[PDB]
Coordinates of C-alpha atoms in Angstrom, one line a residue:
Chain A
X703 CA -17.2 13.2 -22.9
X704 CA -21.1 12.6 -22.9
X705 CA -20.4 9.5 -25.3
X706 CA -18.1 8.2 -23.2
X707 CA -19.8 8.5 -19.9
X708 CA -22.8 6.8 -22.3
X709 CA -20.2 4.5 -22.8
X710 CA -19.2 3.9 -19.4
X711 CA -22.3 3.6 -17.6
X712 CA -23.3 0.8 -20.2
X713 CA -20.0 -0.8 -19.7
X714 CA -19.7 -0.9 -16.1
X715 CA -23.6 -1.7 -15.5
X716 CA -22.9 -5.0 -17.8
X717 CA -20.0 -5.7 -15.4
X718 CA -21.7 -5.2 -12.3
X719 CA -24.5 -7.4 -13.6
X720 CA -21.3 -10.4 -13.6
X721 CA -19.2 -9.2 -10.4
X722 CA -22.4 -8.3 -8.5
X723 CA -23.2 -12.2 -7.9
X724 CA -19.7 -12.2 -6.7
X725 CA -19.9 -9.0 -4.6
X726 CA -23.6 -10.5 -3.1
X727 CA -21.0 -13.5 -1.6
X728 CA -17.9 -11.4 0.0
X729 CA -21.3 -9.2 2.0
X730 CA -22.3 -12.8 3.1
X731 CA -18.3 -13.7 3.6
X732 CA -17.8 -10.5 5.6
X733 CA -20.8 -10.1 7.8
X734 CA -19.8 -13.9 8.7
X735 CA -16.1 -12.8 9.3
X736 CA -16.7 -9.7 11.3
X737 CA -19.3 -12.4 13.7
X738 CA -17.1 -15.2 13.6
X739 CA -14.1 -12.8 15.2
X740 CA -16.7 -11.8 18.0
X741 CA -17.3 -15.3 18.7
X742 CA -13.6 -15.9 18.9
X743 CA -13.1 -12.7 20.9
X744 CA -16.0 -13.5 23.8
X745 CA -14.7 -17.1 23.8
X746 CA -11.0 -15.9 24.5
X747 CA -12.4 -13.0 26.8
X748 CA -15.2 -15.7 28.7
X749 CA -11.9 -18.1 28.8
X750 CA -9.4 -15.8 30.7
X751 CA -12.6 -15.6 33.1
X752 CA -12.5 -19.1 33.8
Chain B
X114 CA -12.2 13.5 -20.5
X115 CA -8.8 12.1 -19.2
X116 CA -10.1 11.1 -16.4
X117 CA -12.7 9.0 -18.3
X118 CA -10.6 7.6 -20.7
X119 CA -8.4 6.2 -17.6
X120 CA -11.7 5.0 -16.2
X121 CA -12.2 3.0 -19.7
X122 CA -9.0 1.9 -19.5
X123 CA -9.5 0.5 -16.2
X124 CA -12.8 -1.6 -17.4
X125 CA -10.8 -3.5 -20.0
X126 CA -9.3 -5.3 -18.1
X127 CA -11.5 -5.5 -14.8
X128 CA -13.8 -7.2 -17.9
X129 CA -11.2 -10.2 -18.5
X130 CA -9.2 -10.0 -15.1
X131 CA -11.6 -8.9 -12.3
X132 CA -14.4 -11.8 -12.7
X133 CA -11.5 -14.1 -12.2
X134 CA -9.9 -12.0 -9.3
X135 CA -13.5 -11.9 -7.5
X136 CA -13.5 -15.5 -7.0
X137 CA -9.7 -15.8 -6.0
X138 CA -10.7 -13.3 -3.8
X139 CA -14.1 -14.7 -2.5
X140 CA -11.7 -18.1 -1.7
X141 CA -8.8 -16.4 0.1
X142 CA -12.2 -14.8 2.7
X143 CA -13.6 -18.7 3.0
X144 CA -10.0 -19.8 3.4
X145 CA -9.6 -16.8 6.4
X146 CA -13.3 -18.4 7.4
X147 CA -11.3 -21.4 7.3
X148 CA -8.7 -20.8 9.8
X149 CA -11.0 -18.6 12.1
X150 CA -13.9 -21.8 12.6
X151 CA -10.4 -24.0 12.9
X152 CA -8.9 -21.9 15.9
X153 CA -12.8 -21.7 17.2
X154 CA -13.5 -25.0 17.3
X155 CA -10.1 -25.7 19.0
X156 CA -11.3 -22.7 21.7
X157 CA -14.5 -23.9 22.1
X158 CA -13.1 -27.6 22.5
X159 CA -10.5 -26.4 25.3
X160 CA -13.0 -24.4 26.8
X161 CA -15.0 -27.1 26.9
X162 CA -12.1 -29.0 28.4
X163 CA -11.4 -26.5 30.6
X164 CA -15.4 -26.8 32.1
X165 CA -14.9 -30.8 32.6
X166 CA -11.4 -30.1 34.7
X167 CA -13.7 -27.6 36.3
X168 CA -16.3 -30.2 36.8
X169 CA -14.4 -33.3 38.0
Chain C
X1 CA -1.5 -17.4 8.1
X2 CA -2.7 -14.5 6.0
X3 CA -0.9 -11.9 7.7
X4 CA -2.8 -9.4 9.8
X5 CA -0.9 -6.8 11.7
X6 CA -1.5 -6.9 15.4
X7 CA -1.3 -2.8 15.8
X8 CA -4.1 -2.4 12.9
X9 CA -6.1 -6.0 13.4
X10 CA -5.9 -5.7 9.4
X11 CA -3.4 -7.1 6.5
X12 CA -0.4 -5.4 6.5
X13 CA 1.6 -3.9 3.2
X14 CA 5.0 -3.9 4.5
X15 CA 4.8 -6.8 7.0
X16 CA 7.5 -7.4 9.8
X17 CA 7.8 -10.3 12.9
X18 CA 9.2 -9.0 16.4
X19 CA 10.7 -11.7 17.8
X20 CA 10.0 -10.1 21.1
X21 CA 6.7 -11.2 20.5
X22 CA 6.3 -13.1 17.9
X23 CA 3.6 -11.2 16.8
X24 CA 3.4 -9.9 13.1
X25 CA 3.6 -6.2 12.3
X26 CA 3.3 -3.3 9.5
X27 CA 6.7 -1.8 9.4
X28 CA 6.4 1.6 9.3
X29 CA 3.5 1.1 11.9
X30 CA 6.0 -0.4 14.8
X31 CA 9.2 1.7 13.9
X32 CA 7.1 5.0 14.4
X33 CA 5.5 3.2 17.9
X34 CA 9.5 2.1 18.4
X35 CA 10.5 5.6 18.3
X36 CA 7.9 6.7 20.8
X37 CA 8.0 4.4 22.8
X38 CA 11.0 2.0 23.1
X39 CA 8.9 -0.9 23.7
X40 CA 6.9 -3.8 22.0
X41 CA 3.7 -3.1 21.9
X42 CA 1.9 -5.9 23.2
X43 CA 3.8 -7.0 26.4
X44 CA 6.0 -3.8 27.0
X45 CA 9.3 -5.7 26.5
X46 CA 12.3 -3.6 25.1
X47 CA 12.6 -3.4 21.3
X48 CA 14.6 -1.9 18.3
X49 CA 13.9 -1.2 14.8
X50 CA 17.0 -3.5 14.1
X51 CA 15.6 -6.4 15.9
X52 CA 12.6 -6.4 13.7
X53 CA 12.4 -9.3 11.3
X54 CA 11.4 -8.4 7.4
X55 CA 8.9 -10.3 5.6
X56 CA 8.6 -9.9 1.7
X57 CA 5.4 -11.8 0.7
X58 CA 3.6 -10.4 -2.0
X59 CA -0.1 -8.7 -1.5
X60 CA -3.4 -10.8 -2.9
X61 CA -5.4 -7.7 -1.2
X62 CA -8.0 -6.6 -3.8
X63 CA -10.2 -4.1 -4.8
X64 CA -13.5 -3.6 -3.1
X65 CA -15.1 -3.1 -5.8
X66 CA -13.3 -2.0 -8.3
X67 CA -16.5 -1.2 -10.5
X68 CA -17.2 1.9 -8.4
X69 CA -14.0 3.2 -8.9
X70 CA -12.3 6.0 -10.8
X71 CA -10.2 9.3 -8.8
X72 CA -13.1 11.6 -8.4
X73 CA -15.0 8.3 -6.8
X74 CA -11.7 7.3 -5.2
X75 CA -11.3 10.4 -3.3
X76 CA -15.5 10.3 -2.3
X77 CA -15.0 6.8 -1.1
X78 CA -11.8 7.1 1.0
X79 CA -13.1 10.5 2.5
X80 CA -16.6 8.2 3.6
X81 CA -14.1 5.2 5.3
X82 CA -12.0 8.1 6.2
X83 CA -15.0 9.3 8.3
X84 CA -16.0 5.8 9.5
X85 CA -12.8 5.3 10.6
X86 CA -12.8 8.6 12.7
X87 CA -16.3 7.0 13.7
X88 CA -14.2 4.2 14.6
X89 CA -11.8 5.6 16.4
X90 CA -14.0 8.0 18.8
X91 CA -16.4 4.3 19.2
X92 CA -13.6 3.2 20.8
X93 CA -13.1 6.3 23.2
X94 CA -16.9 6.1 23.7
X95 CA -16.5 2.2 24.8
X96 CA -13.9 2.6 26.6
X97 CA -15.2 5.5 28.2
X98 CA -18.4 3.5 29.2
X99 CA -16.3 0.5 30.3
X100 CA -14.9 2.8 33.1
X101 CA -18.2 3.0 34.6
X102 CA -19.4 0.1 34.3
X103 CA -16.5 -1.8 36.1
X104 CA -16.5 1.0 38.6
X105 CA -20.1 -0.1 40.1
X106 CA -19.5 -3.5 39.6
X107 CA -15.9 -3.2 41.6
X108 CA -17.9 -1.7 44.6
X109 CA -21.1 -4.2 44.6
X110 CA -18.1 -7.2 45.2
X111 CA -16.1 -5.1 47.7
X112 CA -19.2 -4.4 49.2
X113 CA -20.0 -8.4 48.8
X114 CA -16.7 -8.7 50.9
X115 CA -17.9 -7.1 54.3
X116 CA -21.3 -9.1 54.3
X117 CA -19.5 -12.3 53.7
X118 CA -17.1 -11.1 57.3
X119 CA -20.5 -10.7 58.9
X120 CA -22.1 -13.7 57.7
X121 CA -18.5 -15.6 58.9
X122 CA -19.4 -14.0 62.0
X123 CA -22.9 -14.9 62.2
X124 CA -22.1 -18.6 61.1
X125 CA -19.4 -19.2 63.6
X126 CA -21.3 -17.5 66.6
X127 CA -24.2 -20.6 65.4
X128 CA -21.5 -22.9 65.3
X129 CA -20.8 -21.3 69.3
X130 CA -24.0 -21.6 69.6
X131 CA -24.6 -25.4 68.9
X132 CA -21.1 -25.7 71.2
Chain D
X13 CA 27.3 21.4 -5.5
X14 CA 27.6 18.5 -7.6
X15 CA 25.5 15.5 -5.8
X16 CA 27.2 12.1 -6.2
X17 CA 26.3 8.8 -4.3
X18 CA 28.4 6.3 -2.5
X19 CA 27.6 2.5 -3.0
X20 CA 28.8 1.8 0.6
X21 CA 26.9 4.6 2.7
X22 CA 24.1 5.1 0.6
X23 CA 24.8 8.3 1.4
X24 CA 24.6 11.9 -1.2
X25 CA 27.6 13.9 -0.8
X26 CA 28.9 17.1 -2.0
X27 CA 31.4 16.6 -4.7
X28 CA 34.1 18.7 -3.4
X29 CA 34.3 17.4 0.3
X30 CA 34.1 13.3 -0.8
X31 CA 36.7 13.9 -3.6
X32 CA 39.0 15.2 -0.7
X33 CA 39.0 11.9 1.0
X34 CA 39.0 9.7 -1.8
X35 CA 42.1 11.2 -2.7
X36 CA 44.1 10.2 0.4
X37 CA 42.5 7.1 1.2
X38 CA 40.4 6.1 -1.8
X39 CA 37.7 4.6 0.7
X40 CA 34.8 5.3 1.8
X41 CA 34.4 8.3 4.5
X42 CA 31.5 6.2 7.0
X43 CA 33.7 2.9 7.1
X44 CA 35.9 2.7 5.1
X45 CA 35.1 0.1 2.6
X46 CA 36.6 0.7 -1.2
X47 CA 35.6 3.5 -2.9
X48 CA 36.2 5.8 -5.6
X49 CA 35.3 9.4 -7.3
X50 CA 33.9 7.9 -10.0
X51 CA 31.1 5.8 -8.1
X71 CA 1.4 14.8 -4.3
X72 CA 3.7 12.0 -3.1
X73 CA 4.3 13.6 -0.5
X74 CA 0.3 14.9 0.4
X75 CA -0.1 11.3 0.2
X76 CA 2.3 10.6 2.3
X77 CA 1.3 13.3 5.0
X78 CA -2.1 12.0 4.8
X79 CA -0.5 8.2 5.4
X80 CA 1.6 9.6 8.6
X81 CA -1.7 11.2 9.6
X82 CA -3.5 7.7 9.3
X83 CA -0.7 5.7 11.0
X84 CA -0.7 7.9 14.1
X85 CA -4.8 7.3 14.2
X86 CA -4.0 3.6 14.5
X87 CA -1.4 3.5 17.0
X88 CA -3.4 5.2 19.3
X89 CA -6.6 3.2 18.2
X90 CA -4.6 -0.1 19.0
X91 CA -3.2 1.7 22.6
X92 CA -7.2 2.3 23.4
X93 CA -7.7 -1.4 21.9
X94 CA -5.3 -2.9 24.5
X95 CA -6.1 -0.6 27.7
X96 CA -9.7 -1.8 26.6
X97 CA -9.4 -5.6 26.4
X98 CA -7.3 -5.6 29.6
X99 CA -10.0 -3.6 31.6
X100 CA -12.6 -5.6 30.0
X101 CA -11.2 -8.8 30.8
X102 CA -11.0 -7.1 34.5
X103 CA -14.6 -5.7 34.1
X104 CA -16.2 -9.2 33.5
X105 CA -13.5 -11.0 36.2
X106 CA -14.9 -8.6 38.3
X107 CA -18.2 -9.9 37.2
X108 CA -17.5 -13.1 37.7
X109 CA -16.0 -12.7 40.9
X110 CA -19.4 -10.7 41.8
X111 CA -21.3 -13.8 40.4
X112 CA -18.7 -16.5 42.4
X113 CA -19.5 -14.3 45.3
X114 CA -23.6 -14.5 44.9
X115 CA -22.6 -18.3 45.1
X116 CA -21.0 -18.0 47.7
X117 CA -23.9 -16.1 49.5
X118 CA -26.0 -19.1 48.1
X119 CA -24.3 -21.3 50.2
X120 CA -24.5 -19.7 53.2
X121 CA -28.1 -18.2 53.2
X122 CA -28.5 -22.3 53.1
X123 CA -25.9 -23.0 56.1
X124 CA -27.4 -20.0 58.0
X125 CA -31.0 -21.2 57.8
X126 CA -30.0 -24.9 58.6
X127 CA -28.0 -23.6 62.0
X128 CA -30.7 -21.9 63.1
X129 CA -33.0 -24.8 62.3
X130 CA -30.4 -26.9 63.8
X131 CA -30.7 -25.1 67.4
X132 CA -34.9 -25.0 67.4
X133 CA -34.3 -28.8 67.8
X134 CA -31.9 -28.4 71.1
Chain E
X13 CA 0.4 -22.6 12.4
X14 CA 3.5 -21.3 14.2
X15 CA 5.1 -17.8 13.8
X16 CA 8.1 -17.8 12.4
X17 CA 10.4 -16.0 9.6
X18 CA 13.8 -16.8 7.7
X19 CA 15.4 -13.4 8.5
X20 CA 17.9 -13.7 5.5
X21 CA 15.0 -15.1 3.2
X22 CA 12.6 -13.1 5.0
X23 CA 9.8 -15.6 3.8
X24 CA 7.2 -17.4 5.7
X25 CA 7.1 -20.9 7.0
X26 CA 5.6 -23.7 9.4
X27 CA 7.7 -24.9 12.1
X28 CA 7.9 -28.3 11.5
X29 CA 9.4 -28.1 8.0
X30 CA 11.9 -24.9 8.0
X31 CA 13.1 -26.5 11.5
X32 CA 13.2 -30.4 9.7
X33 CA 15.6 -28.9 6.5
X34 CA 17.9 -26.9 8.9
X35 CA 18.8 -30.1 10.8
X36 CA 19.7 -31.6 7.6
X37 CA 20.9 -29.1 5.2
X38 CA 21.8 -26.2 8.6
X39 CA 20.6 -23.8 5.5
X40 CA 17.4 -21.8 4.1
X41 CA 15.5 -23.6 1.5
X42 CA 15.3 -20.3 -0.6
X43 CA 18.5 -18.7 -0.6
X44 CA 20.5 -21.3 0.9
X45 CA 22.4 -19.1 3.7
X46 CA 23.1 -20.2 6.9
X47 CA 20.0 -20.1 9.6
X48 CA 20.0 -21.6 13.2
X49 CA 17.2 -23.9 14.4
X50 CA 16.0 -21.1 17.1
X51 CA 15.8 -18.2 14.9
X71 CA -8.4 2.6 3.5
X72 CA -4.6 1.4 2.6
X73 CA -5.8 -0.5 -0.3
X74 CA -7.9 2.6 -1.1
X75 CA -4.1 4.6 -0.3
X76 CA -2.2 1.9 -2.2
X77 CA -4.2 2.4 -5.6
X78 CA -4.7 6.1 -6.0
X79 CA -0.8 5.8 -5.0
X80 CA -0.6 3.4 -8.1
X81 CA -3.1 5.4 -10.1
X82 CA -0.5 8.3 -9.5
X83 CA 2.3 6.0 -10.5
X84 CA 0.9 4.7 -13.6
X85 CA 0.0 8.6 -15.0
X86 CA 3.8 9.5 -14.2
X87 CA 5.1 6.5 -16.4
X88 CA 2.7 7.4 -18.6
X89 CA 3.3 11.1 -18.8
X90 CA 7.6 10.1 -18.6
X91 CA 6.6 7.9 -22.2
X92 CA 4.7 10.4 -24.2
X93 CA 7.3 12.9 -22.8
X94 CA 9.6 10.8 -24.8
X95 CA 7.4 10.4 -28.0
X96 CA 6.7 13.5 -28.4
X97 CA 10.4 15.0 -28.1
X98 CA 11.2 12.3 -30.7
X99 CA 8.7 13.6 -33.1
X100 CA 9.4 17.4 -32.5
X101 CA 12.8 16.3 -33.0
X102 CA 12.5 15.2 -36.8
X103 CA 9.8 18.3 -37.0
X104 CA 12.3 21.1 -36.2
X105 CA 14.7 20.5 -38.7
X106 CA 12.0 20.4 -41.3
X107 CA 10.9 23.5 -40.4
X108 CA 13.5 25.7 -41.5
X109 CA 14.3 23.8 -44.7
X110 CA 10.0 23.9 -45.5
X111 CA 10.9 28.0 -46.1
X112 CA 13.7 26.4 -48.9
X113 CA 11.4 24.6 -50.9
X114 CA 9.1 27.4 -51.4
X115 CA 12.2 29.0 -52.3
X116 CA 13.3 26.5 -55.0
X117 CA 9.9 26.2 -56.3
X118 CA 9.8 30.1 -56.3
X119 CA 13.2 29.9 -58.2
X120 CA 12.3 27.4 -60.8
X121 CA 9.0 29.4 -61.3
X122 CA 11.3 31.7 -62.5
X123 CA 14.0 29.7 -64.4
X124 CA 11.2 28.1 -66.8
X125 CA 9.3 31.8 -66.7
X126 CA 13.1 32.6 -68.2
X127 CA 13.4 28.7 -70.3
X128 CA 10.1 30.0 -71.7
X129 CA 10.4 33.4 -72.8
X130 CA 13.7 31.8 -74.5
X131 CA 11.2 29.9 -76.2
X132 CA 8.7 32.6 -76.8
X133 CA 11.1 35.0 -78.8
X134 CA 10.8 32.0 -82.1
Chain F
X1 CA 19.7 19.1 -1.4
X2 CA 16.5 18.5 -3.2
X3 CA 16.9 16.5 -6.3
X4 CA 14.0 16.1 -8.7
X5 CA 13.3 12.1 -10.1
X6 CA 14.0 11.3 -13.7
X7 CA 10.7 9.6 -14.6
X8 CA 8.1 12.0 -12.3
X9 CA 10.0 15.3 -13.2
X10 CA 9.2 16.3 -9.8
X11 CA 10.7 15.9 -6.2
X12 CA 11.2 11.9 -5.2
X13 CA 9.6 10.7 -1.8
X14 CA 12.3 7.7 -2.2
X15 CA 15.1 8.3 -4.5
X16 CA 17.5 6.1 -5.7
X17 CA 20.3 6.5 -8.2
X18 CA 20.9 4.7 -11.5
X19 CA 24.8 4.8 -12.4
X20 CA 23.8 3.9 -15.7
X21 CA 23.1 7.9 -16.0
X22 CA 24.0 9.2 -13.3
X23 CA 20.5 10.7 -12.2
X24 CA 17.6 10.4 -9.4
X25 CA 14.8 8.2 -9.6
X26 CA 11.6 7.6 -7.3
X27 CA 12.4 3.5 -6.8
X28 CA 8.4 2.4 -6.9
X29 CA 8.0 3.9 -10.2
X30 CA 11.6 2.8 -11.7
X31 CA 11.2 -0.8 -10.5
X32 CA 8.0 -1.1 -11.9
X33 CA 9.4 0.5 -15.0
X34 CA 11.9 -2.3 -15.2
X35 CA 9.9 -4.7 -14.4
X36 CA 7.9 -4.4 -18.0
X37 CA 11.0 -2.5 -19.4
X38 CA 14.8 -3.7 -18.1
X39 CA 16.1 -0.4 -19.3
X40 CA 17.2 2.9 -18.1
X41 CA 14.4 5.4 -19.0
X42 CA 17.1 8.4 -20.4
X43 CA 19.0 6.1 -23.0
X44 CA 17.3 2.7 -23.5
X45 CA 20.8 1.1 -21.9
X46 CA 19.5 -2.2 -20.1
X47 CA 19.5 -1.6 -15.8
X48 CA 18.3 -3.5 -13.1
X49 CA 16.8 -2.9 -9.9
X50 CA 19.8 -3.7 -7.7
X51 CA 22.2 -1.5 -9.6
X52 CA 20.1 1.2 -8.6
X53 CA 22.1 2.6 -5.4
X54 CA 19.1 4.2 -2.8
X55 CA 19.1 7.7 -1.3
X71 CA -9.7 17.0 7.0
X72 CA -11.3 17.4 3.5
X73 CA -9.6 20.6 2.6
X74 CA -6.6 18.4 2.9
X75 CA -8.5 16.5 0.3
X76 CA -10.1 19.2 -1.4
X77 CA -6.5 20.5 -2.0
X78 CA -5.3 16.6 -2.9
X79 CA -8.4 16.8 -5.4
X80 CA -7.4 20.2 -7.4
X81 CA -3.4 18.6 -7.6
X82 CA -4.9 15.5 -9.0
X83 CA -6.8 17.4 -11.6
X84 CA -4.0 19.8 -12.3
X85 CA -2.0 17.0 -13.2
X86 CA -4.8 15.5 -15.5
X87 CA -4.7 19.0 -17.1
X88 CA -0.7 18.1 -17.9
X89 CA -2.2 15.3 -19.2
X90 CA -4.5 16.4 -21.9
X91 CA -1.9 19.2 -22.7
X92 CA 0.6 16.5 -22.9
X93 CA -1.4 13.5 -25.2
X94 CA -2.7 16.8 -27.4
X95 CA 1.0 18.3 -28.0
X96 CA 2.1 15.1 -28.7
X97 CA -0.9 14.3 -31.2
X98 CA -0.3 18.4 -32.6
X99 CA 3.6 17.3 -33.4
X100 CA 2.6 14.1 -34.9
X101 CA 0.0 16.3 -37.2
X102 CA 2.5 19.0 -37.5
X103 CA 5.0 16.1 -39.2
X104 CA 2.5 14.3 -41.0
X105 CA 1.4 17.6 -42.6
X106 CA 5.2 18.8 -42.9
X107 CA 6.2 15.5 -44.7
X108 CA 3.1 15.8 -47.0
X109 CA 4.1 19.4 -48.2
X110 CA 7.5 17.7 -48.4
X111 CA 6.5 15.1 -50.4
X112 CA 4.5 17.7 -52.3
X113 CA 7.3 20.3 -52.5
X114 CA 9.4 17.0 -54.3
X115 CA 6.4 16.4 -56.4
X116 CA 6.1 19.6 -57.2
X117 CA 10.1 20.4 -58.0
X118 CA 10.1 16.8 -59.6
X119 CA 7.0 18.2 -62.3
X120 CA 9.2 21.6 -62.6
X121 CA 12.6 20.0 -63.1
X122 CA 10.8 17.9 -65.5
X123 CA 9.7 21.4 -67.2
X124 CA 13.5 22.2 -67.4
X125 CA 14.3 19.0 -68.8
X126 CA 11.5 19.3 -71.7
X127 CA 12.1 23.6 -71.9
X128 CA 16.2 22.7 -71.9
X129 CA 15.8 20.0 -74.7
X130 CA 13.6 22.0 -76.4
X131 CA 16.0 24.9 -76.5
X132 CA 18.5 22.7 -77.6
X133 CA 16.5 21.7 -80.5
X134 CA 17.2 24.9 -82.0

């Protein structure tokens, strides 16, 4: 087990090196999204308003 | 130790598979970014209408 | 569209159209709310299980991230979203909550708003008299 | 005592009872369509029902919420209309009473 | 843009084309039945798979191992015969050679 | 009645019924098993899908220890099946041996039989 856990780590930490660039943009994607749907929401609330 | 070796398992092919995955994945979030700033602008545009009936 | 389910706001797995509506559902979701209720769920018209429209489109949804991952992790990561969620959930109770209090002042400050505007009639039409 | 399945009902039956009708009619006992004799999980599950009755409510407080806070900020805006409204005649008042100091 | 489904080909389409080949062909573009011109979960969903994936897995070495311990069991009680014959033909040429040994 | 699924060996959220054997199987897995397979699980006959005729954290805690008791199966299960395999390949090797062996002997009763005949 300890080799493999060696192993592991050393695995996924090379991997997370090439799917962390990719992670960094769905965070930017998200925190956009989540923003984006509160513009959409106030504009469709401020709308019924007017 | 089974739980590892289904763990290694599961990084062979998130190796090959998953960098490819990410950016279909990554595109399908711009794509729902897409549709979101598309329905958006058409809200702010008929709000926007809206105002200038309000206006005149 | 990418499918979002209107009960959840999120992508269903086992998606379904009421044409009551229009609006696209998660099955099992809607058939449970069907059962208790008897209505659709967003404008209280009558609706059956039967009249619900199947949709088999398959699932792009994706790990997030799979790196993390393994049952042990699993299990720690879904009871921590398990917990935001009940966070979630309780938010929601807490705003709504606080929206009743806030629409109760502002409800009396217009009605309120109401009886000045009948004495300032009053006041304007007795100047009105006046210049009569 | 011996479970067998029907291709029409989808149904499990008990071997001796659907044998019976088989027999006379050779069809199927629901309606009636041809038939013969010889035609974790669930924690997860639990904790999936348990989830799915989390949302339906959630989505109940979501709706109650945007309809009360579309009448919340109506009500707002109402209060706002009426502080133009005010506006207007705090002007038409002072006017009028301007209006009679010149006789 | 528009919501609408096939319910027969319960797929997913845009109301300008499904409603353009039904005037034409009065059928559904994937099946070709009749339709009228008016008509945490991921998290759940894997570990559900993770469990699925173990069972299909456990269902296959269930079957390679019964196939070995198949071939293995019958070997087992003819391995106590060939001791035997080897333990028998010790004997026969312990008898061939004390044949030999008396000239 | 309770039934118990072909492939899981335990009880089936879902069952449905291949007539191809006559017994109970949990649909997501048997699917999925056709899907790389085509076959019926209990006798390699071929089978599709449509033949197939249908039918907190203690919580977790709890979830947790019946996810690692099946990962005990699992160990117990890969190491009985490597044990047989090295239970056969030893078998067949003092098989071989126990030929080898009665092959050098009856080669000692050929020699030992000729040379008694030599007299």
């Amino acid at each position: 087990m300890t080799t493999e856990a060696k192993r592991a780590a050393k695995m996924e930490k090379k991997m997370k090196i090439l799917l962390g660039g990719y992670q960094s943009r769905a965070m930017g994607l998200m925190k956009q999204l989540n923003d984006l749907w509160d513009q959409i929401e106030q504009a469709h609330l401020e709308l019924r308003t007017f | 130790l089974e739980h590892q070796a289904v763990r290694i398992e599961n990084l062979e092919l998130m190796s090959q598979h998953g960098c490819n995955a990410w950016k279909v994945y990554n595109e399908n979030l711009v794509h729902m970014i897409e549709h979101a700033q598309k329905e958006l602008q058409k809200l702010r545009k008929h709000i926007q209408d809206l105002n200038w009936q309000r206006k005149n | 569209m990418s499918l979002i389910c209107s009960i959840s706001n999120e992508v269903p797995e086992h998606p379904c159209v009421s044409p009551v509506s229009n609006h696209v559902y998660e099955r099992r979701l809607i058939e449970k709310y069907i059962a208790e209720n008897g209505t659709d769920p967003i404008n209280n018209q009558p609706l059956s299980e039967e009249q619900l429209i199947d949709i088999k489109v398959a699932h792009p949804i994706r790990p997030k991230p799979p790196s993390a991952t393994s049952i042990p992790a699993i299990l720690k990561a879904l009871q921590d979203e398990w917990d935001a969620v009940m966070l979630h959930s309780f938010t929601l109770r807490q705003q709504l909550q606080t929206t009743r209090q806030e629409l109760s002042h502002a409800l009396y400050q217009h009605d309120a708003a109401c009886r000045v505007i009948a004495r300032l009639t009053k006041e304007v039409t007795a100047a009105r008299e006046a210049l009569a």
